[model samples]
Target: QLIPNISPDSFTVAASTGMLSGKSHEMLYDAETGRKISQLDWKIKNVAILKGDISWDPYSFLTLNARGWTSLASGSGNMDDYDWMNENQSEWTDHSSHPATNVNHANEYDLNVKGWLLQDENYKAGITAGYQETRFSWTATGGSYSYNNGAYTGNFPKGVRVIGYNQRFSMPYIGLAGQYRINDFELNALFKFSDWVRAHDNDEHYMRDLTFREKTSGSRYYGTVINAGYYVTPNAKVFAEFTYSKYDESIGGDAAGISNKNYTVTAGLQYRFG
Candidate 1:
């Protein structure tokens, strides 16, 4: 989304506000079984921004903006587990010990600059670039069980520690956006690309070791996002967006070429102020 003319020559100070919320669900595919399973997921997000345009001739259009966001999600059904062969016990034991239940949260902050390129009565276009930092934390808790003979072999791992992971990603993004006025309605679109440099740490001993000293395997990633919105009312509108994201390198030395990709689509309502 874009904010227009926060600092106009006619006004010393001006501000705008916006908000969004939505929900989504997907079917999980089992590759080996060639079947679909029940795995429901949901998320909620909130964001806010405050922009200040300086009042100098050459820099009058310069905007210093502060923005923040928070999101939460939970998943139902089983999750993949990582384990290794127990050499002495002759059985496979949990390696990473990541649990199955799900809860995750994330937060972000950014300082952005919006540079105006051209302006006319009915349309406006501009280039927006910004430096942003984000953090995500995930938690899962459940017991692990084993079977032996005719009865349950063992109880869940006692004193199972809750593993928590946190990562900080810093990157700069550049994009172009524009708006057009058609009678009483307005249309807008934006696209942005970013390179993510991530540094991760965790409470689990094994995870911390892999995160701190693993140089070659721990690096950066890239992502892209596209958004479009239409104003249904002066202060309210409906919108849709798509985000493409990928990560390079594996958590440990298990695989040589491991990359993860994610695609998300959202439809929701937004409110704007000028």
Candidate 2:
């Protein structure tokens, strides 16, 4: 007797596609402390992802995915301690001596692995996991040294130096997700947990007492996303998603009192091509 198929087809193929999205946000800070300093903060983000799935049997499956993200921020603003010390600037120096104010930029890459278990129709689940790494490059111009005479001056350096400043993060995540489809719409949700290990570049010469130590520390982050999609045509659809995230780390020092709590809401249109 032939056994009924308990899994999706052994050679079933599924392809997932999405857009290359671009986003930007800006903030302005008014003049303060009798200084003619105006802050214009802006950021640009670009992301692209490709995903696919292959089924080998009823009890097991394999999935492969790749993602690329690049973000850049360039404008005049106050320097955060993490940025300032990593670049090796004199601690006591005042911001008025620097010509460029503060400039920050970074880039990141990520890869994912996922497996699925099939139990019955309308009831299936799986575990998804991945790792991500990021690197940064920084530059500050028109910086000056302060003298004992209580006077400040500006200097323009010609070439860029590494300044012994870089950061690496190791992220591991696990999640349980499910999806369901109705008439012409679909609903999906995922509950995820992640751990972030942050590394800093601090040698004896650059050592400073900061909240995040120079060598090793770990932070915990938790978040979730709920999304809904409606299809107008087989190739065209509209979707909306909401996400909430929280980070367990303090900024500056315990006395400075800074916390990271972020949320996002997104709505977009998608089109498909063969």
Candidate 3:
């Protein structure tokens, strides 16, 4: 039997543009000793976000969805770094901070097929299986540093490039998506989790002449998106959303421990066509 409140042979295309502000942090640890070695904190501000989606249903019980997004208008931000001297990692051995001369490029996209489990006039629920990739790159220039005793050591001029890093994650996930409609407002939420995630990083230490390329699989990834939208017209909607994601400790080669976390807020307008 066809699911209630869903029309077969339905199709929708949507486009959204918005502003995103967030922070991402990365850390590394000793593979053998399990000691936290170094960490970087990056503050991102005033970045633009562009997103688009297409959804189609050939039958009442199933839907196919595809989405793509990219970050534009990269900006300057402060980056802080810390290194530990001992295994306990109670004190910092080296501390430095840099100004991001250029924060470049980020993109994330996904494709999924969802099977509807329940549908009604006011509520719809489904389970989705998908593959997604998230990637970004940035660089930090010279700044100041402090040594073991927490005393200011010296300054590295802006001409000296400190570090460059690129990070990417591949995830095959299973998730649940639900939507509730009330009057002119709709609320939507998505939760996704994966145990078979692959984490990859390209890291360069300019002054030290060191580079690291690490890829590790079987890492865990989980993310959530919560949004509320108001329909201004039959085909026009505005929404505000919060997104959060994290990569569980991914260990491989020289990276005894590797992890990353991101939090973002977005406000956008979406135009829908069916």
Candidate 4:
């Protein structure tokens, strides 16, 4: 048997649709000299996102929440690549500065569970735990390159892929959240961080016919989300959110350092029942 207080009237469900945009960067550096030898810069634009949540309060002072979201695979974006010959990167022996041929996808998903420690008429504060997975990939084609001090310089065929790269990040985290309500408006914020993050990559160098597989771990991940919501009706509200996240891995014996950053803005509507 369950508590009678846990009924349909004590639950709320909400959903929203929005757009996400941000930038992603990766670099290969010389550990001793602290110089970049290779790098990739990516831009994410106008990707569609959907989010939903379910919450219940069996007691006036306690609550439980489940939230999830996903970014659709379609988007307009590009990536840039660079490589240098020297530790200082002053000697540019090989380089590709053109936009990539395809920004294959910038897809992601996250799930969270939260338990509120305090709940009252005007404020609620809680603890949150979650898992997030992010995926991004791109292909470069027909870019001009300079090699051996321009002794060899030329343009690649437009249809031929010069390189392809894909990366995935897995992060599990715990955080704190607070929500404050005033009249018809509500303000909510969340902060999360984790020391156990992992990243894996698959890269192809078509020009040189080389492939690289990398596994990196022991990273620090941080994220924050803030939103302002205005209730249009007793059961519904419209809200806008801003999110920022970043992470970096510890340099290891391979002398490789990996990092990523993203910023997102979303606007949508939510509804409550029970």
Candidate 5:
């Protein structure tokens, strides 16, 4: 059975003012265009790292890292085109994001391990391969919006935007990395790919009745990481980095949406003695 995306009405406003929290008393189905509407929002966090590497044979080493996050963050978003029509005709896009609308990014996490090929160092370079698994899950305040073409108006809330479905994604990728060092800085990069492997879908639990293209298991994913680190001393330095990775996967949804791409920008000081 093909899982589907949720219908807005499943969460849309009611004709009764108390029910919908707004003045959009008119048939949400509109008078000019008897149609209804809905929207979607998603987020994924990555790499809060716990990393370490060990070198035993002088020229060989293994590296491992773990990362994740948990928080009760708050945020809001604009309704899509359809919602905008209703929003222009909306009763509460304000209260949801503008009022108290927010998100509970609950938690997101991942793990990675890399093994380097030995042998190197005299007018030559080395190679490294790694495996990474990332997962994310978060809950959001439910929201809603209503539109009626400005035909009707009420002193009530008008329109409301409720929070919605808990969203998440998971992928395990394998990548090859190469690096070159000059002076006190090492420039390295990794390109990873994933063949999602027929994973079972559980997003149905969150999507409820919304209609969405399910995340296809075999759907492939690709990403790249560029890192440059400068060593102030043998054990300390300052570094800044950027990485862009794909995340859109088929778990479940109405239309085909690219698994969200994960982008990261970080800068800080480091001191390592090991």
Candidate 6:
């Protein structure tokens, strides 16, 4: 129970939406931080994602935020293309031999709830908790490699370079949040850490096991948020926000490979209503 000074009847609901565009540099490496040449990590170059949330407060002390994002998995490119083919097909470049580094739908959305320990007109603080459930869909095309050789009994063989991959990541985290307001400007900040992570290969292929379930030694999971808003009027304003997150742990074993880090910048205007 909270809000001892106010009646339980003092309840409110708020929701927000944002569109973000930026670049993501992702790589799949080993737990030792040794870059995996076969597990090829590259840049998506251009990306766009959507985020939104609806939170209802019972007395403005407890807030339940349900949010989702079409992130990390929303960009399109040449599958990390970098003249990767000039590998002298004179000797035959096989698919399995080259390794498939799929940069698929590894980034998804989350659900969170918060408890306000302090609230004010000029400053506020809260305990933040959230979880993410996502699917890693490996979607790619191209390359001519006989899955088994020039015997016409396979696919992506001689001219093959690892194409697509699949898997999933589930994470839960907790941290702290605080905000401050001055005149017509307001700022919000957040820091969080996740310990319980779940990683699994949806349906790893026997022949493609090398590319799937790539492991790591230990995972370093953390995220941060910074948001600033300038009011054009009492009900109309524009804001700029930045989000940074690092997911260095893989599940199902100790092979937590590569570090999946994301950075996003967004600017937009919103209007609130009672």
lDDT of 6 by residue, 1-274 (tens): 1111223423322223444332222233333534332333333334555555455555577866665555534454333322122233333322322233334543466778778899886888999998876544444444334332344424444433344544455778898988888777878898988866654443233345544454333345688888788767654446777777766643333233344556666666644433
- Model 5 scores worst on lDDT over the 10 consecutive residues at 17-26
Any runs in candidate 3 off by more than 4 Å, and if so which? 1-7, 87-89, 250-254
lDDT tens digits by residue: candidate 3, 133-188: 98877788888888775765888876567888778888899999898987768798
Query: Residue by residue across 1-274, what tens digits does model 5's lDDT show?
Result: 1211222212111010000000000012332443333333343332232222222222235545444433334333222223334335544232212232333233434466656654244212234334444433333333332335434433323233333334345566777766666567756677777776222222322324552333445556577766566777655545665556664433233332334445555555544433
TM-score of each: 0.51, 0.46, 0.87, 0.82, 0.54, 0.63
Query: Which digits, one per residue and each the tens of the lDDT, describe model 1 over residues 11-92?
Result: 2222223332222221223335433332222222332222222222235455455554454344322223333323344343
User: For model 2, how does the per-residue alpha-carbon lDDT over 1-274 read when each residue is reduced to its tens digit?
Assistant: 1211233333333333332221211111122322211211111122222323332333346545454334334323222111121123334233223334322444444466556665344444667676655443233333344343235444435332212222344566667666665555756665656766443422111222332223334666565656677766654456766544443332122211111333334555544332
Better of 3 and 5 by lDDT: 3
Local lDDT at 204 for model 2: 19
Listed per candidate, the RMSD to the true structure in angstroms reads 9.5, 10.7, 3.7, 4.8, 16.0, 8.0
Using alpha carbons, what is the TM-score of model 4? Answer: 0.82
Which residue pairs in candidate 2 collide?
none
lDDT, candidate 6, equals 0.52
Per-residue lDDT for 1-274 in model 4, tens only?
A: 1111124437767777776666666667776777777776666666777766677666655556666556655555666666777554486567665554565766666676677788777888999888887777767667677776678887878768887877788889899989998778889999988888888777788889898776678788998989898888766778888888887753344556556777677778767666
Model 3: lDDT equals 0.75
Candidate 4 deviant stretches above 4 angstroms: 1-9, 30-35, 54-68, 88-92, 148-152, 250-253
| Deviation from native of the Cα of residue 142 in model 1, angstroms | 2.1
Winner of 2 and 4 under TM-score: 4
Clashing pairs counted in every model: 0, 0, 1, 0, 42, 13
lDDT of each: 0.43, 0.39, 0.75, 0.72, 0.40, 0.52
Give the TM-score ranking, best first: 3, 4, 6, 5, 1, 2
User: What TM-score does candidate 3 get on C-alpha atoms?
Assistant: 0.87
Q: In model 3, which residue pairs have backbone atoms overlapping below 3 Å?
A: 31-256
